[PDB]
């Protein structure tokens, strides 16, 4: 039967099933007030799927100049054409190669750049903004979005949305690297998976993806989405409560020191955006500091709600197109205040 919601992370994470149901706020606000993330499935079924294809992005925008990042070593690839990224999104034999001659796992940096999404892609902008879940929270003029209503004593989000485009991580060694490193934001955010690209050429990569999900501490209900429903998994997230941020900074200072980094005793390893918590570091955070996170697999059409002040990291299982919008809920506005 079709139901309003279910629970992931062994009862710790709300999953809403109908992205446009006007009754969702009744389910959402109790979990949100506690500082928990929330997942909403099914947003892909509301979108014009022809607007979100990698081939359309290459055809329409391919002559723009951009920078990429090699996810395996953090090296910047400067001043290339955006088609050089998009044409290798799913076809491995078209990817830019590293010195060792392997195809690179690449992230497209800051594209569209700054606040330019609305001006460069007005039809995409309309399609996404009109179909965001929890619209009183997430729409620029929503009654529970304080983004446009606050004085300069608060840090306001930029005008969005923002696009996040990167290849999938492939090997056993890649399991220890992030697409986006551990960091926190002072605004709330909703992040929608609009396209998952399962590649070809090295097409038969199905078992390292299951081992990544399993080692990432993903729940059994999450594994039933793949095996029973054949949903396409895009990315593995770890999210931590805002109240656990200082204990995470203590762990990463101790590890920085063990590894011969020479940081002052006050430095901020979360703001630095330089760490990915692999299986070893997550176990150590739990055993040594008592801190547990939410391990979330974001499938095609899933919208992840990230509370302000919550440390989070992202590991792409396949090639992903994500679009995220920032907002300021009254529940979490304290995290963007500039005093005390």
Ligand X SMILES: Oc1ccc(CN2CCc3ccccc3C2)cc1
Q: Considering beta carbons, is residue 21 or 64 the nearer one to ligand X?
A: 21
Contacts of 315 (CB under 8 A, 6+ apart): 169, 177, 178, 179, 212, 216, 235, 236, 237, 276
Contact flag: residue 17 with ligand X (CB under 6 A): yes
Q: Is 229 in the site for ligand X (CB under 6 A)?
A: no
How far from 221 is each of 9, 225, 241, 273, 279, CA to CA, in Å?
8, 7, 22, 31, 20
Q: Does 21 participate in binding ligand X (rule CB under 6 A)?
A: yes
CA 17: distance to chain centroid? 20
Q: Could you tell which of Cl ion, ligand X, Mn ion, none binds residue 208, using a CB distance below 5 to 8 A set by kind?
A: none
Of residues 2 and 172, the one with the C-beta less far from ligand X: 2
Whether residue 185 is annotated as binding a ligand: the answer is yes
- Residues of the chain by 3-state class (helix, strand, coil), percent to 5: 30, 25, 45
| 18 in contact with ligand X (CB under 6 A) | yes
| CB of 198 vs ligand X, minimal distance in Å | 24
Residue 238 marked ligand-binding: no
Footprint on residues 41-70 left by ligand X (CB under 6 A): 42
* Beta carbon of residue 313, minimum distance to Cl ion (angstroms, whole number): 8
CB of 2 to ligand X, least distance (A): 4
Nearest residue to 269 (alpha-carbon basis) of 180, 184, 337: 184
DSSP E strands, 117-232: 162-166, 180-183, 188-197
- Can you say which residues are annotated as belonging to the binding site for Fe cation? 183, 185, 312
Q: What residues line the site for ligand X (CB under 6 A)?
A: 2-4, 17-18, 21, 23-24, 42
Q: Which residues are annotated as a binding site?
A: 183, 185, 312
């Amino acid at each position: 039967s079709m139901t309003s919601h279910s629970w992931l992370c062994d009862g710790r994470l709300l999953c809403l099933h109908d992205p446009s149901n006007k009754n969702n706020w009744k389910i959402f606000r109790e979990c949100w007030k506690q500082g928990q993330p929330v997942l909403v499935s099914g947003v892909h079924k509301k979108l014009k799927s022809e607007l979100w294809k990698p081939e359309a992005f290459s055809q329409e925008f391919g002559d723009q100049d951009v920078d990429l990042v090699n996810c395996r070593n953090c090296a910047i690839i400067s001043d290339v054409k955006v088609r050089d990224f998009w044409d290798g999104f799913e076809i491995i034999c078209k990817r830019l190669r590293s010195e060792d001659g392997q195809p690179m796992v690449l992230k497209l940096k800051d594209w569209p750049p700054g606040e330019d999404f609305r001006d460069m892609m007005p039809t995409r902008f309309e399609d996404l903004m009109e179909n965001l879940p929890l619209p009183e929270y997430t729409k620029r003029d929503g009654r529970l979005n304080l983004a446009s209503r606050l004085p300069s004593y608060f840090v306001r989000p930029d005008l969005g949305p923002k696009m996040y485009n990167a290849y999938g991580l492939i090997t056993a060694e890649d399991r220890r690297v992030g697409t986006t490193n551990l960091h926190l934001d002072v605004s709330d955010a909703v992040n929608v998976m609009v396209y998952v690209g399962i590649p070809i050429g090295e097409g038969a990569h199905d078992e390292e993806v299951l081992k990544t999900i399993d080692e990432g501490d993903a729940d059994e209900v999450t594994k039933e989405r793949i095996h029973d429903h054949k949903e396409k998994p895009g990315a593995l997230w770890h999210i931590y409560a805002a109240k656990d941020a200082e204990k995470i900074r203590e762990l990463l200072r101790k590890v920085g020191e063990e590894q011969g980094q020479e940081n002052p005793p006050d430095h901020d390893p979360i703001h630095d955006q330089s760490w990915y918590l692999d299986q070893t570091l997550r176990k150590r955070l739990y055993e040594e500091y008592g801190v547990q996170g939410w391990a979330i697999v974001q499938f095609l059409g899933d919208a992840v709600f990230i509370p302000a002040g919550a440390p989070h990291q992202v590991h792409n299982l396949y090639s992903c197109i994500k679009v995220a919008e920032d907002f300021v809920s009254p529940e979490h506005v304290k995290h963007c205040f500039r005093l005390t």
